[PDB]
Design a protein around this nucleic acid. Structure first.
Lengths: 99, 141, 57, 185, 221
RNA sequence: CUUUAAAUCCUUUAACGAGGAUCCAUUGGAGGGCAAGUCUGGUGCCAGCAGCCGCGGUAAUUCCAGCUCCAAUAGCGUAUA
């Protein structure tokens, strides 16, 4: 509904391996692998898929854990990409809902 | 009882001793394995150096994470995992600092929704966490 | 916002009010005397459910 | 090897239930009516009454015409009639068990000063005793928990070194008198 | 607000021919009007609610909850009773439990511990009552001991007039209804026990139904 | 002054020594177990509380602060045999 951007302690990541036990692996836009955690509103109200644009929170004393906040589906994700936040090597690969 | 003879005392004593050893609390309280596996070594409190901070998660009923530190003791060399109790008291602790850990409430048992943690932090840098949390004393600079 | 699991967030963003300067409270024998008086000789015969000491319904 | 005693004991027993209702009600009633300070005093009186009752019970489980029973039972009975909680018409071993906490708390020095007729209230009686105003047989008492005897009840009066029983006045009388002398001079 | 007795016992009590419920207990007649006892025992019959326990029944459209009330009744110098009633509402269940408790009260007897001086204060012997898995034992105590019990049998023993008792319970005492019914059956057994205080040959006096039948045939059909 | 090898401590005793008698009593709680607010403001499954049931999802009786109340009282709470 609204375009909210990243802040201090938050960034964007791409889901690489979709696991169980309410956690997943996401590749952050800084160049490090992290074990993210599914938020309490993100278990069943929304469904997180692979290769999607998500909001990932930083951890200030350990640097191998994270947690996920939001999810951008198609148009706000491509509008955020048009603004410029990521290295251009990463590929969207047309992330949206299929038919 | 079953033996009701006038000269039946050795059998009753041996049966009571065998059924006493065949128990739970007497079994942990009389072997050396249950006290040897204890990282405190039969002690109420222990000291050690904090290496790192870990955010351990809660159980399935409730959704939060628990701020925790990992302690390597000096009396035996074992590595334990102790919870920082109050709100915002993790910021009073940094790496390579000594703390005084204690039990967490149920005598070597995970209490509440925190899995795999049986200890808590009482004092940090030779001053209590309650005095720092209530704003009575200050960390020595 | 900042981060989700910030250490000491709520106590850090809590509003700060000050204590109110009040009269001191009696302690010792006179505290028990006041409690006995207020609980046993200032009571009126009532019916139903007895009201609590802190009832503010 | 030092020459000490190392002999001491507790004078009270805490109750089993920490948060009850009716027990706290009669404890508060006893404290407010007898002007006590805390629950430790009424628990102490309850403990010594329980010890006396326990001794009376274990002597009452015994048989008659036993000389040690007759001896220390008569010792207990003469102690209980000389302390003021028993009468001569009830000099029997079973009548010890019919005693109450009111009988032990009525021989306290505070309520004896209050009922003797020289104190306004029982808290005023405790203040009067604590500030060294009375004496019991040519000897002042600084404490309210002085359990009097039957033969020493008629000797309680004001102390000689007190402004109430005739003596030197206190400090606010002398200070106000000196202020009046300064204002008049 | 008037008394219209449907039984000849209630009419006979209302006609001032029965002095007290002593002979009613002696002849072991069932009491089916709860206000006969309320006439005999009036303002000296206090009560309070032990526990309101909700029970539910599963249907197609959810659960139909119902409230069950436990109340203790009795004068502090003798008789004591207990009643159980369940209904839809709380107040209706409580008033039905009050009527059912006052309908069925039993007399208790008191004895001595050793010497027979003064008034009786304790349970005369060792009685036991059992219902469900709960066992309640009543043991005599010396004078001035008090009631050493759980709070529910303690309040039942104080409302029954017994001043001194030692107790020992076994079973699932967390269920209040079974515990209360067990101590009620324990204290109700004080007259079914035979003691050598009463071994003389009793005389069978005439029943009120035989004694006042000429009054009854005139007062009712 | 007494005590004491000589002192100190206690007791005795003259001169001073309290009105909000500022000469100012704390420790744990307030859903049940278990005595005691369906109070107010803030965060909003976050922070955290919770020995056990469980409490927090943008109207919290349980979190964080103020008021009020409750248990013991120069004492109270916590961890281990």
């Amino acid at each position: 509904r609204e375009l909210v951007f990243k802040e201090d302690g938050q960034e964007y990541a791409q889901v690489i391996k979709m696991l169980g036990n309410g956690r997943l692996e996401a590749m952050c836009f800084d160049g490090v692998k992290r074990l993210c955690h599914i938020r309490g509103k993100l278990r069943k109200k929304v469904w997180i898929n692979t290769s999607d644009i998500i909001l990932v929170g930083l951890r200030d004393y350990q640097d191998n854990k994270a947690d996920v906040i939001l999810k951008y589906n198609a148009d706000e994700a491509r509008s955020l990409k048009a603004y410029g936040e990521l290295p251009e090597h990463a590929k969207i690969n047309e992330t949206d809902t299929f038919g | 009882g079953k033996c009701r003879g006038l000269r039946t005392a050795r059998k009753l004593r041996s049966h009571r001793r065998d059924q006493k050893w065949h128990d739970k609390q007497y079994k942990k309280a009389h072997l050396g394995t249950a006290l040897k596996a204890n990282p405190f070594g039969g002690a109420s409190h222990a000291k050690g150096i904090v290496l790192e901070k870990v955010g351990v998660e809660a159980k399935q009923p409730n959704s939060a994470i628990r701020k925790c530190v990992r302690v390597q003791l000096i009396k035996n060399g074992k590595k334990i995992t102790a919870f920082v109790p109050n709100d915002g008291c993790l910021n009073f602790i940094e790496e390579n600092d000594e703390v005084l850990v204690a039990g967490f409430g149920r005598k070597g048992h995970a209490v509440g929704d925190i899995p795999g943690v049986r200890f808590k932090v009482v004092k940090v840098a030779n001053v209590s966490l309650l005095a720092l949390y209530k704003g009575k004393k200050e960390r020595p600079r | 916002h900042g981060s989700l699991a910030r250490v000491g967030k709520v106590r850090g963003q809590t509003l700060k009010v000050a204590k109110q300067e009040k009269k001191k409270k009696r302690t010792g024998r006179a505290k028990r005397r006041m409690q006995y008086n207020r609980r046993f000789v200032n009571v009126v015969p009532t019916f139903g459910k007895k009201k609590g000491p802190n009832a503010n319904s | 090897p030092v020459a000490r005693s190392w002999v001491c004991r507790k004078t009270y027993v805490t109750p089993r239930r920490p948060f009850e209702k009716s027990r706290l009600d009669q404890e508060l009633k006893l404290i407010g009516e007898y002007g006590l300070r805390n629950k430790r005093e009424v628990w102490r009186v309850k403990f010594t009454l329980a010890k006396i009752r326990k001794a009376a019970r274990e002597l009452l489980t015994l048989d008659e015409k036993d000389p040690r029973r007759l001896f220390e039972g008569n010792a207990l009975l003469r102690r209980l009639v000389r302390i003021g909680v028993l009468d001569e018409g009830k000099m029997k071993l079973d009548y010890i068990l019919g005693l109450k906490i009111e009988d032990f708390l009525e021989r306290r020095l505070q309520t004896q000063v209050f009922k003797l007729g020289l104190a306004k209230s029982i808290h005023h009686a405790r203040v009067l005793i604590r500030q060294r105003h009375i004496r019991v047989r040519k000897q002042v008492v600084n404490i309210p928990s002085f359990i009097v005897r039957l033969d020493s009840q008629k000797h309680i009066d004001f102390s000689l070194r007190s402004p109430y029983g005739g003596g030197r006045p206190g400090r606010v009388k002398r200070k106000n008198a000196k202020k009046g002398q300064g204002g008049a001079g | 607000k008037e008394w219209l007795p449907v039984t000849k016992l209630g009419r006979l009590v209302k006609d001032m021919k029965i002095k007290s419920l002593e002979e009613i207990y002696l002849f072991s007649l069932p009491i089916k009007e709860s206000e006969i006892i309320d006439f005999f025992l009036g303002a000296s019959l206090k009560d309070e609610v032990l526990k309101i326990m909700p029970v539910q029944k599963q249907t197609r459209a959810g659960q139909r909850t119902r409230f069950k009330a436990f109340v203790a009744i009795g004068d502090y110098n003798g008789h004591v009773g207990l009643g159980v009633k369940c209904s839809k509402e709380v107040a209706t269940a409580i008033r039905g439990a009050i009527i059912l408790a006052k309908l069925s009260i039993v007399p208790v007897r008191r004895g001595y511990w050793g010497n027979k001086i003064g008034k009786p204060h304790t349970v005369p012997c060792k009685v036991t009552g059992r219902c469900g898995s709960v066992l309640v034992r009543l043991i005599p105590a010396p004078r001035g001991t008090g009631i050493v019990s759980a709070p529910v049998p303690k309040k039942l023993l104080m409302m029954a007039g017994i001043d001194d008792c030692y107790t020992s319970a076994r079973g699932c005492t967390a269920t209040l209804g079974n515990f209360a019914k067990a101590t009620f059956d324990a204290i109700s057994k004080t007259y079914s026990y035979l003691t050598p205080d009463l071994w003389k040959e009793t005389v069978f006096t005439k029943s009120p139904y035989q004694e006042f039948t000429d009054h009854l045939v005139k007062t009712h059909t």
